[PDB]
Amino acid sequence: LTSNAVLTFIYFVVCIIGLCGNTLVIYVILRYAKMKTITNIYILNLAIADELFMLGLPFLAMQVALVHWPFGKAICRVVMTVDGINQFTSIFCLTVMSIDRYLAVVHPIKSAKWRRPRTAKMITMAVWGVSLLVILPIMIYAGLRSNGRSSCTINWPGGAWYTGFIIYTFILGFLVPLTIICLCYLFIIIKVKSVRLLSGSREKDRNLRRVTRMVSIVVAVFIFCWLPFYIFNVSSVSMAISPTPALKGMFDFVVVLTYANSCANPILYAFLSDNFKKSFQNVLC
């Protein structure tokens, strides 16, 4: 069969690219002393989440290659936990980055206390703790469902629980973060468009204007990659659609589209930044 083979090749390509990129990013941020700023903490935590997902993906590539799941239940639990961490922590980190950019650009005078290297680590720990509290149910109910075949899935105690899960994820994963991000940037734009000099010198103004644009482009790429998945899920929940053979290709396409985003992020930092490019060159060459 061709579909399984091409989707396995794509999974392995994605895994290799993402592992290389995120390992390079983590190493560069931890090794050098010029690269220790307030935004690189959030970038580092995003990279750690993507690295965990990249360590988990080969088992899903295997399961899609041969339809059986031969690895047991203890591995199923861990792969479901990592998939939840990938879905939730990445958006929570992007939300905190956007709030940080708002504080840095619009309120530079008052917010000088909330931007200190001791206060960012507490916010990162709170991000992880809230993410784990949100993940807890899929961690509890993950298991194996027998079709001779076995599959790693979530066995809801039911259906109504599936329709509840779709809404629970659509509301805590897409809507509430995007509203906050949209408000932050709607306010940031007016301020930039009106002011002449942001911080009193041309160098600080220039750096602020570069970093804000990089962050906005990262968020736009995220939205682009994760929109069709939610459109499809909510469309299937709302109206009754009887499954057809055409309903599998669309689902596989949108899922692998979501998976591609983790690979995409370590490539932007090379074009849209200069310190990251200098460091990547100094390390690799």
Epitope: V192, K193, R196, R202, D205, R209, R213
Partner: nanobody, 86 residues
Framework: QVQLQESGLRLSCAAS????????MGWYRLVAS???????KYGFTISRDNAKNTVYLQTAVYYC???????????????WGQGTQV
């Protein structure tokens, strides 16, 4: 990127090109300057029309100077002009 043309008492300076916004303009021998909000500062009379990006002022050489950005996420630059004989 920007282009500044001077004319000719009455002196006039006009700007054209690929511009996003125009900040304070001035005439140098500092002889005149006008902030983007009419807040003039001498040290004649100087006026500014922001509909066409033009600055008017009413012996030696006199140059024109402007400040500009080419985008919203870019750096502040300033452009000079040619000379004129009074």
């Amino acid at each position: 990127q920007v282009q500044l043309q001077e004319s000719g008492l009455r002196l006039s300076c006009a700007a054209s090109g690929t511009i996003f916004r125009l900040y304070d303009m001035g005439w140098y021998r500092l002889v005149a300057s006008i902030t983007s909000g009419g807040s003039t500062k001498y040290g004649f009379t100087i006026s500014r029309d922001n509909a066409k990006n033009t600055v008017y002022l009413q012996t030696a050489v006199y140059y024109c100077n402007a400040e500009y950005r080419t985008g919203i996420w870019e750096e502040l630059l300033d452009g000079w002009g040619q000379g004129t004989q009074v």
